[PDB]
Amino acid sequence: MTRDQNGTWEMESNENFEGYMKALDIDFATRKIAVRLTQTKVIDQDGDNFKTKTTSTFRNYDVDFTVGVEFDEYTKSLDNRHVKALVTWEGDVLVCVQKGEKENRGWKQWIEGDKLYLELTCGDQVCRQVFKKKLV
């Protein structure tokens, strides 16, 4: 029973964020800033209801969803695309498919220990992020 992802999470690694961004057509100048940043993720979870905020000094991004309920996602200030997003549970892994103009776009997020893992995929590019839980 590791579906509880509540907390504030601080990035410790960000593998192939460059390639993921390039697959989303983010311009070089934006990538130059974005690749350098430590991100923080705040997850406020009540059962299958999630409110998430991802922050950095350069851009912030909020997305709220209920597991199992498809929603309209506009990736404002990121790549600024519209997708149909669906989050499901695969075991205790949170899986999101972002159906739209990019093939094989989605993410997967899960807990191990005091770490949160987030794998983001677009096309043939996978970005692997690891976050450590912040003490309250």
Of residues 68 through 107, those in contact with ligand E7Y by CB under 6 A are 78-79, 107
Of residues 1 through 30, those in contact with ligand E7Y by CB under 6 A are 21, 24, 26, 30
Whether 41 has a binding-site annotation, put simply, is yes
**111 sits near ligand E7Y (criterion: CB under 6 A):** no
| For ligand E7Y, the closer CB: 36 or 114 | 36
Taking alpha carbons only, the member of 120, 61, 68, 114 closest to residue 90 is 68
List the end-to-end C-alpha distance of the chain, in Å, as a whole number: 22
Contact (Cβ atoms closer than 8 angstroms) between residue 38 and residue 132: no
Can you name the residues that pair with 131 across neighbouring β-strands? 11, 116
Taking alpha carbons only, the member of 130, 73, 64, 125 closest to residue 97 is 73
Whether 129 has a binding-site annotation, put simply, is no
Of residues 31 through 50, those in contact with ligand E7Y by CB under 6 A are 34, 39
**52 sits near ligand E7Y (criterion: CB under 6 A):** yes
Figure out which of the listed residues 60, 66, 88, 104 binds ligand E7Y, where binding follows CB under 6 A.
Answer: 60
Tokens of 50: 């999630």
Q: Return binding residues for all-trans-retinol.
A: 41, 109
